[PDB]
Amino acid sequence: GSSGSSGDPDEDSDNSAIYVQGLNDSVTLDDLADFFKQCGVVKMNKRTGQPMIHIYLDKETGKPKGDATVSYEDPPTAKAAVEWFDGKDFQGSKLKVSLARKKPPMNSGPSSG
């Protein structure tokens, strides 16, 4: 109970990227760029004009295992996009979106072992 509102607390998850997991073996960048953009706008390079989306491909065959990452412009969009695509259905497969950089604080963090 202090006098005067000197700045209010809020989620400072600078992380504006999201980690997707559950993509098919036929998923393409453009396919993820046009979809991930559903929520907001996907950080598009100003020099290459390409989306900041990554699609890890199995070094065994070269196909997209299913995991990927989408870097959004601002955090406000990334955090909103996570719960947006989190649990979506791509080509019949379930997608799992989660802020790449996610970790619990220290205060009241651990409970037991």
How buried is 110 (Cβ within 10 angstroms: 0-12 exposed, 13-18 middle, 19+ buried)? Answer: exposed
Residue with tokens 């600078």: 14
Strands across the sheet with 67-71, in order? Answer: 53-54, 67-71, 17-21, 96-98
C-beta pairs of 32-35 under 8 Å, 24+ apart in sequence: 32/68, 32/70, 35/85, 35/90
Closest CA to 95 of 4, 44, 27: 27
Do residues 100 and 81 lie in contact, with contact meaning Cβ atoms separated by under 8 Å?
no
25: number of Cβ within 10 Å? 13
Do residues 36 and 42 lie in contact, with contact meaning Cβ atoms separated by under 8 Å?
yes
Give the method used: NMR
* CATH of span 15-99: 3.30.70.330
81: number of Cβ within 10 Å? 25
> Interhelix angle for 29-36 vs 75-85, to 10°?
100
Q: Reduce the DSSP state of residue 35 to 3 states and report it.
A: helix
